[PDB]
Amino acid sequence: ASQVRQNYHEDAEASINKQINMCLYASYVYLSMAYYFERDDVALPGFAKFFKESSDCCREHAQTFMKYQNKRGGRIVLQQIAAPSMQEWGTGLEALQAALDLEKQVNQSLLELHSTASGNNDPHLTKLLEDEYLEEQVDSIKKIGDMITKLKRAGPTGLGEYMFDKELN
Amino acid sequence: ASQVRQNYHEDAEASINKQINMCLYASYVYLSMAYYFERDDVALPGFAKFFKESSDCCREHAQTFMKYQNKRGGRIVLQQIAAPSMQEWGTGLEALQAALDLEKQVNQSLLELHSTASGNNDPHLTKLLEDEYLEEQVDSIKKIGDMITKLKRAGPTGLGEYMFDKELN
Amino acid sequence: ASQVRQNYHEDAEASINKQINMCLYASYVYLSMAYYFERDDVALPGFAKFFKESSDCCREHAQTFMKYQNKRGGRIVLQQIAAPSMQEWGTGLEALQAALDLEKQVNQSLLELHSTASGNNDPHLTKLLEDEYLEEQVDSIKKIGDMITKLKRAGPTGLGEYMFDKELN
Amino acid sequence: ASQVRQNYHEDAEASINKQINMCLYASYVYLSMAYYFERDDVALPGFAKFFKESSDCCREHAQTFMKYQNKRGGRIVLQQIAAPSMQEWGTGLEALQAALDLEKQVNQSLLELHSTASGNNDPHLTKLLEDEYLEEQVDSIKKIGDMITKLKRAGPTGLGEYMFDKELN
Amino acid sequence: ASQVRQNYHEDAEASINKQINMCLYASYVYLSMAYYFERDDVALPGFAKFFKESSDCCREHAQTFMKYQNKRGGRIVLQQIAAPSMQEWGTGLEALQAALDLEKQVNQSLLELHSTASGNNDPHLTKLLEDEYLEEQVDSIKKIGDMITKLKRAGPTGLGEYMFDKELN
Amino acid sequence: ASQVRQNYHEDAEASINKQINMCLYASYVYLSMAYYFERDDVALPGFAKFFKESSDCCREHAQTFMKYQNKRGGRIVLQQIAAPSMQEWGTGLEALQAALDLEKQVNQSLLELHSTASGNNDPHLTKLLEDEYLEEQVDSIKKIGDMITKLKRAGPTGLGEYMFDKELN
Ligand SMILES: [Mg+2]
Ligand SMILES: [Mg+2]
Ligand SMILES: [Mg+2]
Ligand SMILES: [Mg+2]
Ligand SMILES: [Mg+2]
Ligand SMILES: [Mg+2]
Ligand SMILES: [S]
Ligand SMILES: [S]
Ligand SMILES: [S]
Ligand SMILES: [S]
Ligand SMILES: [S]
Ligand SMILES: [S]
Ligand SMILES: [S]
Ligand SMILES: [S]
Ligand SMILES: [S]
Ligand SMILES: [S]
Ligand SMILES: [S]
Ligand SMILES: [S]
Ligand SMILES: [S]
Ligand SMILES: [S]
Ligand SMILES: [S]
Ligand SMILES: [S]
Ligand SMILES: [S]
Ligand SMILES: [S]
Ligand SMILES: [S]
Ligand SMILES: [S]
Ligand SMILES: [S]
Ligand SMILES: [S]
Ligand SMILES: [S]
Ligand SMILES: [S]
Ligand SMILES: [S]
Ligand SMILES: [S]
Ligand SMILES: [S]
Ligand SMILES: [S]
Ligand SMILES: [S]
Ligand SMILES: [S]
Ligand SMILES: [S]
Ligand SMILES: [S]
Ligand SMILES: [S]
Ligand SMILES: [S]
């Protein structure tokens, strides 16, 4: 095996590789949203910049897990990255609702992995999850929730959406 | 002939002179729009500044072609500059739609001239058109398209137009 | 009609629109001279720069009139700008003599505009004509007179014209 | 359809979407190599950094194409990104030889895209391919060729590979 | 053969070797003229400086073509550089007329190379020719033409030539 | 003949003209070497830099001789520059041995030029050869001798040549 591997269970190794794929996929989904909102017949630059930032964030989440896999002496296994199923995202509100569901899905998967690591008594992995993932998932979910409420107050269509988009930019 | 003229076909020379007139005319049209939107009974300073910038831009497009004509050893021939046919432009949306059509008309004429120059194998002229005209025409057209979509979302009349105008300023 | 118009006679409104067109024509004429003197077989860069600056000055003159029309509550009506009477201006001396006659003709037109404003007792308009046009016009005429005398001493052809051109540049 | 689309053939729209997917795959392949060379039992940090930068470059290449698609008025259609053909790249030399073949294949694909744009007389697209892709592609291929020659001189295994890696870092 | 070579026709490779020789020859001609104008019995330092600069420029043109040859994977083949057509260049006017004919011949050879590249569908080579050579060649020809006109007006012999020479100092 | 000429023998004047051609030829040989080591299948950037510097140095030697010819009132006579005897220079060691032989050939020719000047009692020319050519000629030969010794110790091939090349860069 690895000259560095210690207390690193095989099911944690495989779970990291699935988590890497999930964050790459979320990144792809955000990239799709970002360029949709830059279409000339959509033109919501605030939404576009917000989702482009989320795409980069998810790509770093995946690269952090890859580094971690190498740090613990496991082996990275990259899988195909599915395309987003629907690539016409509709209104800015509908995209925020989809993003909120995507982030909750990632959180649930991260909480599953913390339970896995805690069951095999891997405190190094549980610490990584608490410091680098769990806290920012909860902050993303709260931020999107706040945004949905603000957008429904302002709009959510027409002049209200145009003004909400300007705050995002 | 010219001591400097080389590989410069007469039909390119004449086409440059027509293109010079077209951009002077577009500049005039934009100047007309700019001072319309500064009327006391219109008062859309954002629209006024946007069209005044477009007027100056078109005047430089024409002066660049005049310089080019002299650089290649052809002769500049200036023609009358027709007045804009309608000088009451209506709403800010209607002026953007007219501007979008004017810019597409200029683009089509520029693409015709690239085909002319390419047919007579004038790579110096095709390069000038690609570097200095074609790329900025496509960017103008995309910018105006974006603006029309934003204005329809915000307004396009009343408080929405007033707020869109403030972003333009 | 206009909520701002006061003591602004239709006489003045129409003469201002005619003066806008006149200064735009003069600017076009100066532009034609400027690029004539940049031809490879003329190559008089000082003359070209001088006439470039006169072309810019006359365009500001026209824009100050359009701003004035809107300030007083009149309506700007643009007319076709005629092609310059000739495209080929000959020597540096012949171009200066044409500009002198062009500025004297603009000056006579402004003096007529001042006289009709005085007849209509419009002190705001006579103030504008005195401060922003009649001064500049007399300065331009004196400057061109000086240059013609200097050019005739130095040249007006050959090495003298070459030397006098370097002073303009 | 699109209020901005002009002279943009469906041929080009579809090949741009295919090229977006291709550069995203190449970026994924480069990412796999980068983290392979950071494994504790490989430990080639210069190679890892080099392939990290190539992964970032290819992702910008893909994003410039998505921006271009929106600029011209086409529609971006994302496709699944395939998993890299292998996860385990062997020696530094074998990875460079794979990257050289990957860049040559991307280059052939871009030359085909240029040829179909020329056939459709789309000078805006041929300009984009010349300035932002074909240059960089030829530079990348030359650079990788140079490194393979240098690596073969120094090593390609043992102390030579260790030394050549320090130069990349 | 070459691990980097792609889409590079043997005809382009041979034409590049010939173009390298042509610019080396022109560099040599300008060097000759520069030192001719520094003879004690000629003493035209402005002309000397102008031709020295032209000499360096052509040498840099040759070296960019040699770099290009290596970048595409062709092989540089250096040929003899012919002695300049004259040892003594007569007047400043005659030297400028010689340089104008030299730059026109170089321009013509470049346009033929462009047409060759187009026929073989080599967009990377046509791009290089459009960006690094054709524009500077047209500017260079226009500059020399301007100078010949200025020197014919000033001189072309005697005090006028002396004064024109200070312009280029 | 020359109003400046004094104590300048036609023997010296002819020898100076041959020495100019000899240093132009050596410059050309170094240029060929420089771009040979930049080939993708050679890739020795240290040697390339070294020979490109040697190329510039020999060209300045030739121009210093052309200046001197004019200073003394002799007449520069330029001949063909022969093609380099080789187009491919083998290994780095083989290039250095050819450079060593070429620098000794130039030194021997300079020493004969010094003998000529001494024979005709031209102390100004013996002073030029001592202070600007002979000392720097002896330094170049010593430096190349040093390099040959260092490269034979390090290499002369493989990793040693790769490491030696880095001290040159
Ligand atoms: Mg286990
Ligand atoms: Mg013709
Ligand atoms: Mg009235
Ligand atoms: Mg189509
Ligand atoms: Mg071939
Ligand atoms: Mg010869
Ligand atoms: S984010
Ligand atoms: S995020
Ligand atoms: S982030
Ligand atoms: S973030
Ligand atoms: S996430
Ligand atoms: S503009
Ligand atoms: S514009
Ligand atoms: S502009
Ligand atoms: S612009
Ligand atoms: S335009
Ligand atoms: S002026
Ligand atoms: S003026
Ligand atoms: S002015
Ligand atoms: S002025
Ligand atoms: S004027
Ligand atoms: S004036
Ligand atoms: S890169
Ligand atoms: S790359
Ligand atoms: S990059
Ligand atoms: S790069
Ligand atoms: S690439
Ligand atoms: S690349
Ligand atoms: S030059
Ligand atoms: S030049
Ligand atoms: S240059
Ligand atoms: S130049
Ligand atoms: S040249
Ligand atoms: S140049
Ligand atoms: S040139
Ligand atoms: S040297
Ligand atoms: S040197
Ligand atoms: S040197
Ligand atoms: S030398
Ligand atoms: S030397």
Side-chain angles (χ1 to χ4, degrees):
Chain A
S2 214
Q3 73 194 332
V4 314
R5 198 197 185 107
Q6 192 179 14
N7 195 45
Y8 192 52
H9 189 126
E10 249 168 281
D11 58 14
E13 185 179 1
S15 276
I16 300 296
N17 282 330
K18 319 327 155 217
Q19 207 56 54
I20 285 157
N21 193 264
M22 198 172 173
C23 279
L24 292 175
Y25 172 74
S27 175
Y28 210 15
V29 162
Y30 283 130
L31 187 77
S32 176
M33 285 182 192
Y35 281 88
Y36 173 79
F37 287 107
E38 261 178 37
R39 284 184 55 89
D40 77 83
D41 59 347
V42 175
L44 285 162
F47 283 103
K49 183 188 49 37
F50 173 78
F51 289 122
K52 187 132 73 188
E53 297 169 328
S54 300
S55 175
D56 295 333
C57 163
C58 277
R59 187 177 56 244
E60 247 317 296
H61 290 347
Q63 272 164 351
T64 303
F65 274 128
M66 286 161 90
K67 260 157 267 165
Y68 187 80
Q69 192 78 280
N70 272 348
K71 203 188 287 104
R72 296 301 301 283
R75 283 307 164 249
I76 304 160
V77 183
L78 303 166
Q79 302 278 55
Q80 59 200 28
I81 302 162
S85 180
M86 182 70 266
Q87 292 173 44
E88 264 149 284
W89 298 98
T91 70
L93 180 51
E94 291 163 335
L96 288 180
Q97 284 159 337
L100 179 67
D101 159 273
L102 184 54
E103 298 285 334
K104 271 147 138 202
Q105 192 190 322
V106 169
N107 197 219
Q108 189 52 55
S109 172
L110 286 168
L111 293 172
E112 266 163 41
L113 170 56
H114 188 281
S115 149
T116 288
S118 156
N120 300 311
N121 305 282
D122 196 337
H124 191 270
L125 179 51
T126 55
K127 156 188 199 86
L128 168 86
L129 296 172
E130 284 160 30
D131 275 51
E132 311 267 346
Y133 293 92
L134 288 184
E135 229 203 335
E136 65 87 23
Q137 282 306 303
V138 161
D139 283 335
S140 279
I141 289 168
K142 171 64 160 49
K143 177 176 226 220
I144 296 173
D146 290 342
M147 287 170 64
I148 287 173
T149 299
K150 297 204 228 195
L151 181 46
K152 284 162 165 179
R153 174 179 293 113
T157 72
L159 175 63
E161 187 181 40
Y162 168 85
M163 306 286 319
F164 181 80
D165 179 79
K166 266 148 62 135
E167 281 328 284
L168 231 45
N169 205 31
Chain B
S2 214
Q3 73 194 332
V4 314
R5 198 197 185 107
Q6 192 179 14
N7 195 45
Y8 192 52
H9 189 126
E10 249 168 281
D11 58 14
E13 185 179 1
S15 276
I16 300 296
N17 282 330
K18 319 327 155 217
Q19 207 56 54
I20 285 157
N21 193 264
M22 198 172 173
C23 279
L24 292 175
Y25 172 74
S27 175
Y28 210 15
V29 162
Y30 283 130
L31 187 77
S32 176
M33 285 182 192
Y35 281 88
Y36 173 79
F37 287 107
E38 261 178 37
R39 284 184 55 89
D40 77 83
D41 59 347
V42 175
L44 285 162
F47 283 103
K49 183 188 49 37
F50 173 78
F51 289 122
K52 187 132 73 188
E53 297 169 328
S54 300
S55 175
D56 295 333
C57 163
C58 277
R59 187 177 56 244
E60 247 317 296
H61 290 347
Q63 272 164 351
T64 303
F65 274 128
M66 286 161 90
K67 260 157 267 165
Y68 187 80
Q69 192 78 280
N70 272 348
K71 203 188 287 104
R72 296 301 301 283
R75 283 307 164 249
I76 304 160
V77 183
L78 303 166
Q79 302 278 55
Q80 59 200 28
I81 302 162
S85 180
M86 182 70 266
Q87 292 173 44
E88 264 149 284
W89 298 98
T91 70
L93 180 51
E94 291 163 335
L96 288 180
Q97 284 159 337
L100 179 67
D101 159 273
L102 184 54
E103 298 285 334
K104 271 147 138 202
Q105 192 190 322
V106 169
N107 197 219
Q108 189 52 55
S109 172
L110 286 168
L111 293 172
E112 266 163 41
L113 170 56
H114 188 281
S115 149
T116 288
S118 156
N120 300 311
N121 305 282
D122 196 337
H124 191 270
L125 179 51
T126 55
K127 156 188 199 86
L128 168 86
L129 296 172
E130 284 160 30
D131 275 51
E132 311 267 346
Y133 293 92
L134 288 184
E135 229 203 335
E136 65 87 23
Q137 282 306 303
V138 161
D139 283 335
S140 279
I141 289 168
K142 171 64 160 49
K143 177 176 226 220
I144 296 173
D146 290 342
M147 287 170 64
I148 287 173
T149 299
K150 297 204 228 195
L151 181 46
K152 284 162 165 179
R153 174 179 293 113
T157 72
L159 175 63
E161 187 181 40
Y162 168 85
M163 306 286 319
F164 181 80
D165 179 79
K166 266 148 62 135
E167 281 328 284
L168 231 45
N169 205 31
Chain C
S2 181
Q3 73 189 323
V4 315
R5 194 194 187 108
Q6 187 174 21
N7 196 38
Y8 192 51
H9 193 113
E10 278 275 321
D11 270 2
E13 198 182 342
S15 301
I16 295 286
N17 280 332
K18 191 198 191 283
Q19 194 72 40
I20 288 163
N21 185 261
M22 196 184 185
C23 280
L24 290 174
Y25 174 73
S27 157
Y28 206 20
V29 172
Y30 283 137
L31 184 72
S32 170
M33 295 181 187
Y35 280 96
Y36 169 80
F37 285 114
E38 277 186 42
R39 286 168 40 162
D40 75 279
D41 60 352
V42 173
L44 283 170
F47 282 94
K49 181 183 83 108
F50 178 75
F51 290 122
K52 202 94 91 193
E53 288 157 2
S54 309
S55 178
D56 279 340
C57 154
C58 279
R59 185 177 60 250
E60 315 326 311
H61 286 342
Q63 301 209 30
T64 301
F65 272 129
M66 302 168 59
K67 266 173 263 264
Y68 190 80
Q69 189 82 279
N70 276 345
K71 218 182 262 143
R72 292 305 295 285
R75 197 187 265 303
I76 296 155
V77 181
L78 301 171
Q79 299 282 333
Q80 170 157 287
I81 307 166
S85 40
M86 58 197 339
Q87 310 290 318
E88 220 182 322
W89 299 96
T91 67
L93 176 57
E94 309 172 299
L96 288 184
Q97 286 162 329
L100 176 75
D101 282 331
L102 191 54
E103 304 289 26
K104 284 173 131 168
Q105 164 183 11
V106 168
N107 195 35
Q108 211 78 261
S109 174
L110 291 164
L111 289 165
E112 294 176 50
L113 188 36
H114 189 279
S115 151
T116 75
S118 323
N120 292 331
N121 304 104
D122 184 339
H124 192 265
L125 175 47
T126 56
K127 197 244 190 273
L128 172 91
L129 294 168
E130 287 170 24
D131 300 348
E132 246 284 349
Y133 291 91
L134 292 178
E135 247 155 32
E136 267 224 39
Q137 219 45 38
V138 155
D139 290 346
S140 288
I141 285 159
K142 173 62 159 40
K143 183 48 41 203
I144 291 167
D146 293 325
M147 290 152 77
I148 289 174
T149 302
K150 288 197 247 234
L151 181 48
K152 281 179 175 167
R153 165 176 302 112
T157 68
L159 175 59
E161 173 179 56
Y162 169 80
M163 296 307 302
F164 175 83
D165 183 82
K166 303 176 95 263
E167 271 322 275
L168 283 192
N169 204 26
Chain D
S2 181
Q3 73 189 323
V4 315
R5 194 194 187 108
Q6 187 174 21
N7 196 38
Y8 192 51
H9 193 113
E10 278 275 321
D11 270 2
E13 198 182 342
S15 301
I16 295 286
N17 280 332
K18 191 198 191 283
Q19 194 72 40
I20 288 163
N21 185 261
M22 196 184 185
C23 280
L24 290 174
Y25 174 73
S27 157
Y28 206 20
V29 172
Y30 283 137
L31 184 72
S32 170
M33 295 181 187
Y35 280 96
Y36 169 80
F37 285 114
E38 277 186 42
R39 286 168 40 162
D40 75 279
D41 60 352
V42 173
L44 283 170
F47 282 94
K49 181 183 83 108
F50 178 75
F51 290 122
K52 202 94 91 193
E53 288 157 2
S54 309
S55 178
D56 279 340
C57 154
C58 279
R59 185 177 60 250
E60 315 326 311
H61 286 342
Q63 301 209 30
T64 301
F65 272 129
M66 302 168 59
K67 266 173 263 264
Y68 190 80
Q69 189 82 279
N70 276 345
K71 218 182 262 143
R72 292 305 295 285
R75 197 187 265 303
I76 296 155
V77 181
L78 301 171
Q79 299 282 333
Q80 170 157 287
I81 307 166
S85 40
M86 58 197 339
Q87 310 290 318
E88 220 182 322
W89 299 96
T91 67
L93 176 57
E94 309 172 299
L96 288 184
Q97 286 162 329
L100 176 75
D101 282 331
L102 191 54
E103 304 289 26
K104 284 173 131 168
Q105 164 183 11
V106 168
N107 195 35
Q108 211 78 261
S109 174
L110 291 164
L111 289 165
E112 294 176 50
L113 188 36
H114 189 279
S115 151
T116 75
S118 323
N120 292 331
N121 304 104
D122 184 339
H124 192 265
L125 175 47
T126 56
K127 197 244 190 273
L128 172 91
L129 294 168
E130 287 170 24
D131 300 348
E132 246 284 349
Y133 291 91
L134 292 178
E135 247 155 32
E136 267 224 39
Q137 219 45 38
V138 155
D139 290 346
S140 288
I141 285 159
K142 173 62 159 40
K143 183 48 41 203
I144 291 167
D146 293 325
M147 290 152 77
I148 289 174
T149 302
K150 288 197 247 234
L151 181 48
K152 281 179 175 167
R153 165 176 302 112
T157 68
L159 175 59
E161 173 179 56
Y162 169 80
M163 296 307 302
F164 175 83
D165 183 82
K166 303 176 95 263
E167 271 322 275
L168 283 192
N169 204 26
Chain E
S2 190
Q3 79 194 319
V4 308
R5 199 191 178 118
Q6 197 175 16
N7 196 42
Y8 195 49
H9 195 296
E10 43 149 24
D11 286 358
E13 169 187 12
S15 290
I16 295 286
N17 283 326
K18 188 42 172 243
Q19 208 58 223
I20 281 152
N21 196 262
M22 207 163 182
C23 283
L24 289 175
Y25 170 73
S27 184
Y28 202 21
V29 167
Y30 287 135
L31 189 69
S32 174
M33 302 183 171
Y35 279 89
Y36 165 81
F37 286 109
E38 297 195 350
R39 285 163 53 158
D40 74 273
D41 61 351
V42 176
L44 282 164
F47 283 95
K49 177 175 275 104
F50 172 79
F51 288 120
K52 188 61 211 315
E53 293 172 358
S54 303
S55 186
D56 291 354
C57 171
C58 281
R59 198 185 47 252
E60 158 212 32
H61 291 162
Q63 292 181 353
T64 296
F65 274 130
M66 299 163 78
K67 199 167 330 309
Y68 187 82
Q69 187 79 281
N70 275 345
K71 202 183 300 138
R72 295 299 298 284
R75 290 291 155 259
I76 299 163
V77 175
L78 299 180
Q79 277 312 80
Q80 70 284 357
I81 305 160
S85 61
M86 302 289 272
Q87 306 292 342
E88 313 184 340
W89 301 92
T91 63
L93 179 47
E94 296 173 306
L96 285 175
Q97 292 163 326
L100 175 68
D101 289 358
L102 189 61
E103 306 285 12
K104 275 189 186 151
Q105 283 190 354
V106 167
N107 196 34
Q108 181 54 46
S109 164
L110 292 172
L111 291 166
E112 261 143 43
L113 184 43
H114 187 282
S115 161
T116 283
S118 297
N120 300 326
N121 297 109
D122 194 344
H124 192 273
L125 173 54
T126 62
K127 202 244 185 210
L128 165 86
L129 290 170
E130 281 168 42
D131 287 347
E132 304 275 278
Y133 293 96
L134 293 165
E135 69 307 310
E136 300 192 87
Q137 211 55 35
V138 161
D139 293 345
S140 178
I141 282 158
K142 172 63 152 64
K143 175 64 102 214
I144 287 152
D146 299 337
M147 293 170 58
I148 288 161
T149 301
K150 290 167 162 185
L151 173 63
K152 275 165 170 173
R153 170 177 299 115
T157 58
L159 176 59
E161 181 178 54
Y162 171 83
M163 300 293 320
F164 178 81
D165 178 78
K166 304 175 130 18
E167 205 199 303
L168 329 176
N169 220 11
Chain F
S2 196
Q3 81 198 314
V4 311
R5 199 186 178 124
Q6 179 175 26
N7 197 37
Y8 192 51
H9 192 118
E10 33 184 32
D11 263 6
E13 172 184 10
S15 277
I16 299 263
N17 277 334
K18 308 262 278 224
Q19 195 69 40
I20 285 153
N21 188 262
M22 179 166 216
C23 279
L24 289 175
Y25 173 75
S27 181
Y28 203 18
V29 165
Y30 286 138
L31 188 70
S32 170
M33 279 180 202
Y35 285 93
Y36 170 79
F37 289 109
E38 276 185 17
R39 282 167 42 159
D40 75 270
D41 55 2
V42 177
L44 283 157
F47 287 92
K49 176 183 244 43
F50 180 75
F51 289 113
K52 183 148 190 13
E53 260 143 37
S54 293
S55 185
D56 298 354
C57 155
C58 283
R59 180 177 58 245
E60 284 284 57
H61 289 167
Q63 301 199 37
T64 294
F65 269 132
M66 304 166 67
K67 262 167 260 291
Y68 189 83
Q69 190 79 283
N70 276 350
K71 218 173 289 141
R72 297 302 296 285
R75 290 299 160 248
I76 300 156
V77 172
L78 302 175
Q79 321 135 40
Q80 183 204 256
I81 311 173
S85 47
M86 316 274 264
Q87 306 293 327
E88 295 185 77
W89 296 96
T91 62
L93 181 59
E94 284 158 354
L96 286 178
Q97 306 167 128
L100 176 60
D101 163 284
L102 179 63
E103 290 304 40
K104 274 154 140 176
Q105 264 167 222
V106 170
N107 193 39
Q108 180 73 221
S109 182
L110 288 173
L111 290 167
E112 292 178 44
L113 193 24
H114 191 283
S115 207
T116 314
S118 284
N120 301 140
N121 302 117
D122 189 338
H124 190 269
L125 172 56
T126 61
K127 191 244 192 272
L128 172 88
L129 295 169
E130 283 162 33
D131 300 349
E132 322 266 25
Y133 289 91
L134 293 180
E135 48 149 270
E136 142 158 41
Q137 212 45 35
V138 153
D139 290 339
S140 295
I141 290 159
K142 171 61 154 60
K143 171 200 210 333
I144 295 162
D146 287 353
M147 274 148 90
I148 296 188
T149 298
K150 294 208 244 202
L151 175 57
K152 282 172 166 166
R153 175 177 300 115
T157 70
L159 173 61
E161 167 187 72
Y162 169 85
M163 292 303 306
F164 175 79
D165 174 76
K166 309 232 297 271
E167 97 161 74
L168 274 183
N169 205 6

